[model samples]
Target: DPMEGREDPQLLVRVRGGQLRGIRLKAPGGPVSAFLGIPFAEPPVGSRRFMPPEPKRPWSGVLDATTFQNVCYQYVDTLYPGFEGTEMWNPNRELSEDCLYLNVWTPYPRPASPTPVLIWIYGGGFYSGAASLDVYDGRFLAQVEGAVLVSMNYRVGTFGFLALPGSREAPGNVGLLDQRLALQWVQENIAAFGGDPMSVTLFGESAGAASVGMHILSLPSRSLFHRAVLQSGTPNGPWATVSAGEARRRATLLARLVGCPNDTELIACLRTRPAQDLVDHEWHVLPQESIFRFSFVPVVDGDFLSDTPEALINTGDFQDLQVLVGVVKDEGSYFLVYGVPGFSKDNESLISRAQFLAGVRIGVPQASDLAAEAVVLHYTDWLHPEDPTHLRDAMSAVVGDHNVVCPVAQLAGRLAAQGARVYAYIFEHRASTLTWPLWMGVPHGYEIEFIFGLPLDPSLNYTTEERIFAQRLMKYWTNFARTGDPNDPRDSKSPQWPPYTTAAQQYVSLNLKPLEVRRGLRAQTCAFWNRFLPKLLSA
Candidate 1:
């Protein structure tokens, strides 16, 4: 028997491509209409390989869009032992080349007219991620927020981002272009799904947040979304984006690994090679020291990204839009377990003084000896130069600041100074499930489950207070999506989330019951990275 959706006239909806059928699901708040595996782009397979995605052609009959689709080909099996934390992050479906589908979740007996749309872009360091992941299920968000929650699966790794400078066929950042096409698809089709195309809010975590930053910065995709909520990472991160030289080098390495070919025939030859080969090879291309960073990333293609995001941030070249940016309490804490090579199984996970310096170099690969030594002095605990715990703390700060915390804060500060309406937060709560290590605080991307209302579900055991906290965080997010201000048109009793300004630099601290408005988040450390390091590097 064919795997298909149950026949229901109520679930049938027509879009630009054709008619499709979705499924209905029961939830705590209300019933939700779940539309899955709806293609926005034609299969980027065969000759279409390495090119920008084309719109999906029209199809006859009601397409069976009830089940989730295949995840884009990606290598998720981390060989490093005790990488079990990455398990939940892996794609749950079959991997394939023809994977440019998107899903939408809306309240059943849908309130017509215009409900705000919150389109989620999943995060996995730009190398691996899929919207079909269980943690991303948008039903609870759809029902609670009264917004149509949309998530799209775009190409990742070599299948998506391969920058071959000269070859127009493989320009750069097709992964970004895939996202752009998805935005365009939403602008056209979301209205049919009871969503307001005009009021769409794009949001994501880590690399996904950087992608949102790209859309917010890039002129072509800027106007497609009205609001953006970036969690943990921004395009301005030191390691967030790759340079043309690095991107090209990585691409060339991939081509050579698969088949010894020149730039002219590299992409064509790559197209012929098995996608599995490319994914596996690309995974191993970067050394193990390069943790939390990927082999390939978005690049400055003339069409999509005209200049470096750091340059863009400095010059205030981007248009103004409402934004809500957040960083976890311990952005670097995740690295202690995942990024550090001998972290998981090692006894007490002790780090040496030498290893801490090496981590700093990995944090900023371009740092000179003088600058690197200065970094060591800046963060090193004077009392215990070689103590394991102190070294771990120092290592955490170096890695966290250079890669995430400093860059995100700098991005938000510049936007606020330029008169963009911006709101900021610090996520201080970690789930009961994250009982991994005592040393780790609320790590990077831990705030997502709370954002998506994962704790609210009864499927597993999350603390009762954690569930309540998750609810509060959801209100804060969808609150911004509705009014561009988290406090305005206030739906809950939560304290006012103030607009971020260079003078005040206020942000909400979300831990448990009592939320506090904190000021000057990592102020001194951020200055070290944003101001001191830049000057030191250029010297």
Candidate 2:
């Protein structure tokens, strides 16, 4: 029975002393005593907005956690053409400033032995995503991978990163703080769910990957997770940032948009505005990356982040933590089809494009020149060599390198140099079913279905091979979660999953048909990226 456990039509059984309850899902494999929705931190709404996440006031009585929770309010999604929950993904859902919820999936009635814990952060830029996405279902990972799976939703968009003059008092990055709170919650309560707190592995794709990187480098969050899996993101090379000056600039722009001049008054006006209005304003700023959209990254708040997370990470501050980070080989393929603006296969143009897209200028960035160069460089550096129609492939590579590949290499190399155990992989399988081009190559976020070990969403163009690869991929990922390393010892046929470092360079090359290793190949590219880093500050 879907509703196997409870009271009334909905299933909610009391667990622990607080009477906290959950939904029991009998999935394809077996009965999952799953908890769908539970608040891990206090609502960051009203006065709580922009403040560090606070511990959710412990409840004395039972809390009903049967259904999925609402996603933070977001601008309407135009990317996914025929998405299932058209209205749900819209800004029309129950808008609440109080949306810091988490979900857990466990194989029911397990042996007393503790299971390794895997906490996932979903990817949708910093604006759109929820712990509740069906694609992120933890039951599969929990049952198939032999571990506990937890997915969560933190503040997003305006609620997560609305920064202004007064923002310094509260500071930005509530989303990241919410993540910390989730980990803290796991540390405190995971034992009850049959998991080891010390064995936590944090994993996520895209922006979620970047979030994991930020957490790994944070002082406040250093002890939260022992291992990390970065699917497709890195913080170096000017991915995102907001100085007090930039914050002030954004504040002034926000005030003008809201028709208010007084900083305090503007802040109050936004605080009271409808969530939809706030989200709409958030999207309006999306097109501008360097200044606003991708620009809205985790900040160096001086408290949680002593010095920049990037700086600390580069200096080997997180050398002790084990990490496995990677990117899809044709990661740029998807952007070419759906997101990237210009359409061309010109290599030099692609390089110039990437330089502009990344806002790359040796010294202080030139808005126009940097913008153009970012677009060119991104494509040229990343073109798929085998594909004849690879000009566009080049463009895709730029997106891949800047957004995924380079960052993964950067962080991995830094940590390995500092003497941490680091393993890297490149998922190059092109899913036949995804909207992003499979023939062209693997696209952005393509690793999602495989990592979660979920059947290809018909929407994602999953072929039979895609499903087969997904199984193997999950095996690798779950193995990493269980033992801080991805190589499956039971299978001797598969290529050796090599440890990455400056010398004796190695990385597994994951593809649709067979898993192989491209040993020693990454060294050149890694060095190229190391030298290509953007010069950010001025004397």
Candidate 3:
């Protein structure tokens, strides 16, 4: 009875290996269809653990895909607790290691013309996210925005990225390989779901954006998708990748902590440890590894990533696809609320001078005292009378610029310089439902709900202005997916989003009133981080 198939003529669909019974759902705009929990690969269990994904075998009958499946193994409480406004992002579904499923959302009654498709890659520092989160629901994008949408659950944390240098069995970045299989499945099977196989765009936020960046820079995955979006991240970001030696060291440490012998057969021994033991102990590898930054992440594995992103970009090896790249006003605040010093969710009124200097040190941890002091002076607001709030602003800016804002700008500029059609934006709108204190000021990834069109949901209580802003955002995104330009589906309400060219470096400030297109976001400061800081450090 548990696995029995239930279907309606309106919901049944076929894919490569099997037929799936889907479900009907109500969107704010209209009705839509969704096929959830579709297994795209065989369960990642037993000998297949830490190995590349294998395509799913054909099912004898229609598989029931009416409900979302178990999320990949992750300690939600381990990451979500001890922070305000985090309960919403946590995945509450059943967790298991056998998770490698995907969900598809499309228009009801099947459109006459195949719709453009948008596939999502979720972000949890490469170690702690699932596609089942409410913020990622694609119903609104499908029903209202006129696009087919898909999201997948890939392995995370130690369960997915366990690196073994020479061993073929435990090569790192299994999560990305899982994603690759899903992309291939879309190419083969998405046409059956009323989606255009030729016009697929890959997009993501945070770590997910970095994955998109990696996919774009990677030579092997070049032909999988036609377009890409990088939201507040880039593969070039310092934190996005780790050295092969570091990956091996961490994997070895994790194995030994679980009583697995450290040798060539280390992979076999790590397989013997309980899943919970690996999840709980991996974070202890280094004292400084914070939840904001993860120890396990993408590596420059010669096969997947031949060289560093910049080096690859220099080789002119990556494709010339259209890219949308951006960052929020305060990208680093999200990490500050979680296990950070000098900034707290509850205590938001003032950040003292000592704390401001401490925050700057965290961003450029290896910089000399003179270098750190120079960073502080650049962010200081000397024109305005000094107050503790200035210290707070400076600290947040320091962290944001060093970690996200500057890196994103550098990426957009680099890609644009290399002859890729790039569009850049800085999201300035703060949502109404944010629970963090007033001082958080458009925290990292704050624009996700609006980009996903949350305010347009009729059942939810949102301001009319918020609804308008969300509508504009969706239109800009979908229009870009359809046509490489975001302004083609011209709306009187939304302002122009210009191409981020090597010459002009233009971008739009996405907001409610006065949605203005400006040139260069924090130009002077970004220059400090991108151009001057490295030169200064080397000197």
Candidate 4:
């Protein structure tokens, strides 16, 4: 009786035509069908090198689609060996370069008409991660929220974003371009799987969120999706970008490292390097070496990307779009923990380093202490007024905000000012189940458990309070996915959400106790940072 509408084939066999041969499952309440790893683009290999992704040529005969595709090359499970029973991986699976695949989850009857589509992008600092991460399975969000959930993988690490001057003559932002290609595929083919292209919602976290954000300024992504939800990453703020000239310089250095200094020879030599070796060598500084390391990111190439991505958002460049963006309260803690260490409450050292990198004293005397003291004094008050415990937090917030949140808020405000729909939130909840010390507060990525709707594993034996907090997060996120509005009145004991405006400045704060909405935090802090930002950039 429970399986009424769910009794269809559980497998997909490709027929002579492009039709999907599928078996449905008996979903608990509604419809149930699963379409595992389906190819959406050609493998990034051989001649494709760093070129933009291309649509896959259709397969001819019946093709059996019974399993998920291998995730992109990443750290093996042996790296984090704990809590085996709760979250499991396919032991037989293998990694590969041919990883541009997508999966779908939909309810029964295929709906009388097409359903709204939710496409998820994954984040691993643009160097690691995949659609296959356990925390990201879209079944719950798709089924409970009554929408079509799509998860797909793009190239990662070196394979996805190696930039050489003519280093592969590959496109500058291969990973970013890969995301655009996936969105295009969704527009053309989502309907065949019972999804509506026009109502598409682009969503993701961390690096994934940044990718979605860049789409707002990307001309190729202008009409691809109507709405976006950016979680944990707001890369559009006032941050530094690797310039095209700088990129070429870095590329030449990398080429030299690989023993191929000639641009043409560099391209050919890099194309044949193994993915692992390439990724291992991509990082200029290892995690243990320095905290200031940067890797393969979407450079301001002046083409696909005009200027700085942050500048585009700050200037109201993408105003006519619907958006929801937020960051975890202690988003910087994770970066502080395992990231390059040694950046302490050492304000003097921090300022000195910033000056060196920005060349704040570049044209001036090398020994000149020009901008160091001014920068330190300004950031000290703007970030940590007197809270000693938040020292790491303050440093991270300033740096992270400069690179992520500030840009997100600016983008939202710009879009809202232009009379478009915009909503914002700040996730402040600190799950007690994490192994970190209590005083550290909510470490970065701490909200992932709730934001992603991960099942309660004993490892994170979240207290009763934590579980309730997770429910609130689910309601907020799922509601937005269904319709553009995130304020869900129908949910159980949740708060009303509001759209953003310059004067009103309303934003939700997700906390472990009760979710609340307040005017805004860090107003003064952001202003302080913003005031000196232009000076800092120009100097």
* Poorest lDDT segment (10 consecutive residues) of candidate 1: 1-10
- Give a tens-digit lDDT track for model 1, residues 98-186: 99999999988665889999999988887899999988989888888777999999898888887786577788788888898999999
Tens digits of per-residue lDDT, candidate 2, 1-539, equal 33444454333434333455666675556666677678887777786766678887767766777677777766556755665423233443355677788888877654268888999998777777778876687877776666788888888776786666334434677788899888988888888778888889999887788788888777678788889888877655445445556655654565456555545566776666667766656544432423213434566666555666567777755557788888776654444433344432222223233433433322113234544343344334354433334544454554555556766777877888887888888877655555432345565676676777666334445676766787788888888888877878788887678788778667878886565666653455445545643442222
**TM-score for each predicted model, relative to the true structure:** 0.95, 0.84, 0.94, 0.82
Pairs of residues at least 3 apart in sequence or in different chains that clash in candidate 1: none
lDDT of 4 by residue, 91-136 (tens): 2346887888777777654555888888888776776667766667
Score residue 86 of candidate 3 by CA lDDT: 80
Off by over 4 Å in 4: 1-31, 74-93, 165-168, 238-241, 285-293, 314-319, 339-375, 378-390, 456-468, 489-494, 512-514, 537-539
Pairs of colliding residues, candidate 4: 8-23, 8-24, 9-23, 9-24, 10-23, 31-108, 164-167, 234-404, 236-310, 237-407
Ranking by lDDT: 1, 3, 2, 4
Residue 501 local lDDT, model 4: 78
Backbone atom clashes (below 3 Å) for every candidate: 0, 40, 1, 10
Number of the top-ranking candidate, with TM-score as the measure:
1
Winner on TM-score (1 vs 3): 1
lDDT for each candidate structure:
0.82, 0.66, 0.81, 0.63
Model number with the top lDDT: 1
